[PDB]
Amino acid sequence: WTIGIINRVVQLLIISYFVGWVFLHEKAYQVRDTAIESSVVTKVKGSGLYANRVMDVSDYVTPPQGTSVFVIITKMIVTENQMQGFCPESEEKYRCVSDSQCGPERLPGGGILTGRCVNYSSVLRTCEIQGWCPTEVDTVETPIMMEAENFTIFIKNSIRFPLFNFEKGNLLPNLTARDMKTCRFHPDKDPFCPILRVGDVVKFAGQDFAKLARTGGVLGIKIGWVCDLDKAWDQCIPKYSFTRLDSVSEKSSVSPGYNFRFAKYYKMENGSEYRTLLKAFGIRFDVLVYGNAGKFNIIPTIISSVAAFTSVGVGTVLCDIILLNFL
Amino acid sequence: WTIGIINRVVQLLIISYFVGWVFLHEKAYQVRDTAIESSVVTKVKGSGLYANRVMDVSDYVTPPQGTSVFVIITKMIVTENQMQGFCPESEEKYRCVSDSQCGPERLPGGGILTGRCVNYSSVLRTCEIQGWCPTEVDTVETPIMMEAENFTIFIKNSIRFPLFNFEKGNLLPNLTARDMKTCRFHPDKDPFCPILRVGDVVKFAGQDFAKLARTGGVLGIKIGWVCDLDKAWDQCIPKYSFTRLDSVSEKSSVSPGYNFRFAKYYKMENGSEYRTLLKAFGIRFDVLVYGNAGKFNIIPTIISSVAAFTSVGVGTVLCDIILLNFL
Amino acid sequence: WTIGIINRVVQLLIISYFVGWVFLHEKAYQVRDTAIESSVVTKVKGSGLYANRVMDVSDYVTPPQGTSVFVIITKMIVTENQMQGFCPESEEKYRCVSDSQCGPERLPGGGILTGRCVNYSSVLRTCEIQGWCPTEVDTVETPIMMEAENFTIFIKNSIRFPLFNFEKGNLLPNLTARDMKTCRFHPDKDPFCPILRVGDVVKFAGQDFAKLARTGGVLGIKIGWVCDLDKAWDQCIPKYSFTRLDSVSEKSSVSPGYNFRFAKYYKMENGSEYRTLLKAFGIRFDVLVYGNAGKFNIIPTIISSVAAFTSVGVGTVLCDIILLNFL
Ligand SMILES: O=C(O)c1cc(C(=O)O)c(C(=O)N(Cc2cccc(Oc3ccccc3)c2)[C@H]2CCCc3ccccc32)cc1C(=O)O
Numbered sequence: 017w018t019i020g021i022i023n024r025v026v027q028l029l030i031i032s033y034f035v036g037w038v039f040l041h042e043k044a045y046q047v048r049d050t051a052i053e054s055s056v057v058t059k060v061k062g063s064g065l066y067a068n069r070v071m072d073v074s075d076y077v078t079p080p081q082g083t084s085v086f087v088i089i090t091k092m093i094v095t096e097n098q099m100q101g102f103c104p105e106s107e108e109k110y111r112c113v114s115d116s117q118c119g120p121e122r123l124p125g126g127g128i129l130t131g132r133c134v135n136y137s138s139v140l141r142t143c144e145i146q147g148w149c150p151t152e153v154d155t156v157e158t159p160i161m162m163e164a165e166n167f168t169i170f171i172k173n174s175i176r177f178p179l180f181n182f183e184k185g186n187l188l189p190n191l192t193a194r195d196m197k198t199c200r201f202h203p204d205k206d207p208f209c210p211i212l213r214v215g216d217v218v219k220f221a222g223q224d225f226a227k228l229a230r231t232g233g234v235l236g237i238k239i240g241w242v243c244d245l246d247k248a249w250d251q252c253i254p255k256y257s258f259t260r261l262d263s264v265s266e267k268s269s270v271s272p273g274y275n276f277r278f279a280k281y282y283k284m285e286n287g288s289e290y291r292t293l294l295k296a297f298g299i300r301f302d303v304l305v306y307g308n309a310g311k312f313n314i315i316p317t318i319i320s321s322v323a324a325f326t327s328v329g330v331g332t333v334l335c336d337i338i339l340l341n342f343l
Numbered sequence: 344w345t346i347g348i349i350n351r352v353v354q355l356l357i358i359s360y361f362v363g364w365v366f367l368h369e370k371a372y373q374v375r376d377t378a379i380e381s382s383v384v385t386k387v388k389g390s391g392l393y394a395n396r397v398m399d400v401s402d403y404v405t406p407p408q409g410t411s412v413f414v415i416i417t418k419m420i421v422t423e424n425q426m427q428g429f430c431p432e433s434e435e436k437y438r439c440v441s442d443s444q445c446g447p448e449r450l451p452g453g454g455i456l457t458g459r460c461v462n463y464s465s466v467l468r469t470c471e472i473q474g475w476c477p478t479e480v481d482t483v484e485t486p487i488m489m490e491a492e493n494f495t496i497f498i499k500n501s502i503r504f505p506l507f508n509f510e511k512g513n514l515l516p517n518l519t520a521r522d523m524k525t526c527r528f529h530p531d532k533d534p535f536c537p538i539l540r541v542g543d544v545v546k547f548a549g550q551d552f553a554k555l556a557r558t559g560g561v562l563g564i565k566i567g568w569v570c571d572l573d574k575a576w577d578q579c580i581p582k583y584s585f586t587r588l589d590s591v592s593e594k595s596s597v598s599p600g601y602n603f604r605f606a607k608y609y610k611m612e613n614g615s616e617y618r619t620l621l622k623a624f625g626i627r628f629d630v631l632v633y634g635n636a637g638k639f640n641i642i643p644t645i646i647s648s649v650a651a652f653t654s655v656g657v658g659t660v661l662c663d664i665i666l667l668n669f670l
Numbered sequence: 671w672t673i674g675i676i677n678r679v680v681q682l683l684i685i686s687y688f689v690g691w692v693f694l695h696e697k698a699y700q701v702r703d704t705a706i707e708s709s710v711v712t713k714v715k716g717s718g719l720y721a722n723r724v725m726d727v728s729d730y731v732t733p734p735q736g737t738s739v740f741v742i743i744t745k746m747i748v749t750e751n752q753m754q755g756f757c758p759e760s761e762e763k764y765r766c767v768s769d770s771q772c773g774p775e776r777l778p779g780g781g782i783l784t785g786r787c788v789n790y791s792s793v794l795r796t797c798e799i800q801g802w803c804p805t806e807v808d809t810v811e812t813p814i815m816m817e818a819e820n821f822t823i824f825i826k827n828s829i830r831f832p833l834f835n836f837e838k839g840n841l842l843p844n845l846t847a848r849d850m851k852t853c854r855f856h857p858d859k860d861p862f863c864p865i866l867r868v869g870d871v872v873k874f875a876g877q878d879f880a881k882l883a884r885t886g887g888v889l890g891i892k893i894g895w896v897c898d899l900d901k902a903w904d905q906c907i908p909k910y911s912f913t914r915l916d917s918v919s920e921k922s923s924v925s926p927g928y929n930f931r932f933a934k935y936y937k938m939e940n941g942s943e944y945r946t947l948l949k950a951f952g953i954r955f956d957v958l959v960y961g962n963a964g965k966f967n968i969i970p971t972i973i974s975s976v977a978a979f980t981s982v983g984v985g986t987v988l989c990d991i992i993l994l995n996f997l
Pocket residue numbers: 268269270271713714715822823824840841842843846850851852863864865
């Protein structure tokens with residue numbers, strides 16, 4: 017009967033349409049390179065006020081070279097003119113009643129204990145230690161540099177898909193409005209401007225600059241390069257996203273934020289050495305460049321072809337059995 | 344007829360040969376690991392002359408630890424003995440006629456304006472600012488360290504393909520001529536020497552050391568590990584390429600080169616603080632290690648097998664139809 | 671005969687079982703993301719004694735920001751109060767007999783030779799050089815900071831599989847015993863504690879802290895994220911491994927270890943500049959985060975399906991031919 021081939025022909029048409037759209041949707045004919053090779057060069061701009069001092073890029077940005085991970089210092093704690101010697105630790109955890117509890121068995125991983133129980137103040141008695149004196153007092157409250165909200169981060173990103181030798185950059189004057197220096201990045205109004213406002217980045221990550229500057233934190237400027245190298249060279253475009261990386265988990269057991277210690281080493285006219293100990297709180301920025309490209313290839317196209325051919329050939333039989341049975 | 348099977352047998356032989364060479368060429372029987380895990384340790388060697396001073400590795404290399412990204416400083420601008428205070432900015436962009444145009448609305452992202460219009464010199468009148476005084480003069484011309492062309496970069500690279508747990512290194516004494524310390528890297532005469540001459544790297548990237556040292560730049564020493572783990576362990580070999588990463592695009596809108604600012608912080612005998620502000624131009628080197636290995640696997644070999652089997656089975660039918668029709 | 675279909679049915683059952691277990695074992699139905707996107711934040715804790723000085727985290731850890739690569743300085747060589755000038759190099763390789771062998775042709779890549787042959791001591795005569803004087807004496811023996819064995823490394827690692835947008839962290843209070851701060855990492859007793867003991871890390875890598883601290887070295891804290899995103903979110907877990915990265919190859923031709931030079935720059939009350947030159951030996955730690963996830967996908971499941979269908983269909987024929995023939 018002719019209808020039998022009109023039922024099968026319709027069967028093959030329809031079933032082949034489902035399979036066809038599926039394989040075409042997932043780019044099953046494409047080999048994929050997911051090992052992007054990126055270089056990131058950053059430039060921070062701005063000036064702030066801390067105490068009665070003025071901070072410029074040389075004072076609060078560390079490191080200076082413009083790497084993919086850098087820190088904008090917003091708050092710090094200074095302990096000036098330290099010098100090697102003996103002094104009572106100011107940490108309460110080092111409280112003692114007699115020299116019998118200031119032995120090596122106590123706080124093994126901590127500082128160097130001299131073995132004497134001394135009076136830091138009239139209200140506390142702590143183990144004496146050898147090291148930089150006086151000791152640090154990290155329980156005080158200090159101001160935060162608010163101007164850092166208006167600082168700008170300029171990100172130059174140069175990536176390359178090696179499997180295809182397809183290299184491109186994120187400096188695109190055509191995609192962003194002229195006076196490029198004057199652009200700033202908005203996810204909607206200017207999603208291709210390489211200049212990021214610090215406060216903006218803090219907002220895009222859903223973070224309060226006050227609490228963040230107070231406790232410090234780690235933010236990530238994410239550059240994504242999902243590209244179809246079958247389309248125009250013009251179509252491979254970077255997409256920026258933002259996130260806070262220092263988990264604020266309720267379970268915690270650890271204080272949130274981000275801070276680190278460094279000293280400025282001075283030597284005396286008399287030749288003795290003394291440093292300024294600095295506890296720095298700021299916003300570390302990690303530029304994380306992900307990307308994967310897909311290019312047509314003969315091998316994946318043949319495998320997907322055979323897959324769809326055989327799969328349809330079975331689906332038509334199964335559909336014929338389902339029909340003849342009628343249920 | 345016997346010829347019918349001699350035509351089909353020849354058909355199957357030939358068609359199967361096309362498919363066979365294609366799948367065998369693309370290593371369709373191989374699973375691929377494109378997530379190389381590399382460690383890079385670098386060592387720079389050399390000494391230069393700048394002004395009437397001698398620069399050693401401790402003076403021009405930053406950072407010192409020998410990471411995958413480092414900078415060889417070739418030119419710098421010094422502003423010595425700065426101290427917090429008030430002074431007229433030297434940038435022309437800060438020109439003013441009266442204190443009415445030195446308000447917060449002007450240059451919001453710039454320095455801290457005091458609000459006074461002062462006379463930097465007799466020919467210019469600029470807004471006064473609070474910060475490190477005197478201000479920087481980044482419009483002067485300074486020499487460049489030419490000896491940096493003869494510096495050598497030693498790159499230790501240790502990579503690992505985790506999917507196969509196949510780890511190897513780029514220090515290969517057998518592939519490079521003895522007196523290894525005396526080797527230097529030429530793409531043809533010594534393509535496995537880990538010692539790179541700075542000037543050589545500048546040449547391999549097609550760059551002029553004069554202009555590059557003058558304006559600074561970003562070069563990439565690329566280590567590629569394309570390997571067939573089906574062949575001998577001896578065959579997985581690294582291949583070095585070179586490129587300049589700071590786009591010099593005509594569209595530009597940004598000054599090419601690479602520079603960053605850092606200060607040397609001194610404290611006075613009287614206790615006041617003062618720094619030396621340094622604008623550094625140099626050549627940043629980014630070691631970019633790409634790699635992908637292919638090892639025989641049962642799953643990809645079966646999928647490719649089925650693919651070629653079915654594909655030939657259809658190609659022979661299509662070729663039979665093309666022949667019987669004769670066109 | 672009915673037995674013919676009982677032989678074929680058993681044939682299809684058995685053969686289909688081999689193929690089925692194979693494809694199910696290799697997760698052939700899974701698409702794989704091998705481009706993990708990780709952020710690493712490290713914190714070192716401890717204090718040591720070197721000479722009659724006390725070293726804290728600000729003195730021996732470099733860089734300070736807590737990156738994925740950092741160095742714990744264990745031994746160092748100090749050359750104090752250097753100043754630009756002329757002096758005889760102390761390296762024996764610079765031995766001379768007359769000013770005729772101190773020309774530019776000698777040691778082209780080395781220091782700046784003045785051209786004079788001078789007497790460093792009564793037993794050696796070396797070329798004079800311009801640079802930081804006095805010169806460094808890197809042939810002396812210095813102590814090593816032993817307390818560094820008891821230091822602790824705290825590693826915060828935040829990764830993300832972008833293909834699935836599946837992000838997770840390595841701070842897992844449920845997997846590690848409470849008093850999290852008090853945990854320390856043992857591969858068996860506490861394989862999820864983020865706090866690493868320096869000495870432990872040195873042991874897990876099969877290295878002697880004595881020789882390592884003496885010569886310096888490069889260790890890698892490896893975080894592996896092999897995950898089946900088909901299983902519970904709870905099952906994607908990090909696994910830590912350890913390795914020494916500075917090859918100690920017998921062929922060598924290079925001194926093992928790891929060291930770098932940096933200076934502390936001082937300026938004189940009289941205004942002249944002088945530095946302290948420091949050769950630092952320590953243990954560099956490189957946090958290397960690998961990972962690959964597998965999630966069920968329609969495309970790979972269909973391709974593997976067709977593969978097994980066709981492959982079984984041929985295996986049954988081949989097995990029938992092998993049986994009928996009987997050999
Ligand atoms: O100044 C301080 O007093 C200070 C206090 C702390 C603290 O939290 O107690 C810290 C700190 O963050 N850690 C890390 C830490 C904290 C809590 C829990 C931790 O373990 C887990 C958390 C969650 C999930 C799984 C495990 C890890 C310390 C704790 C112990 C060991 C140790 C070693 C090295 C470095 C730091 C720290 C740092 C400092 C400092 O700057 O010197």
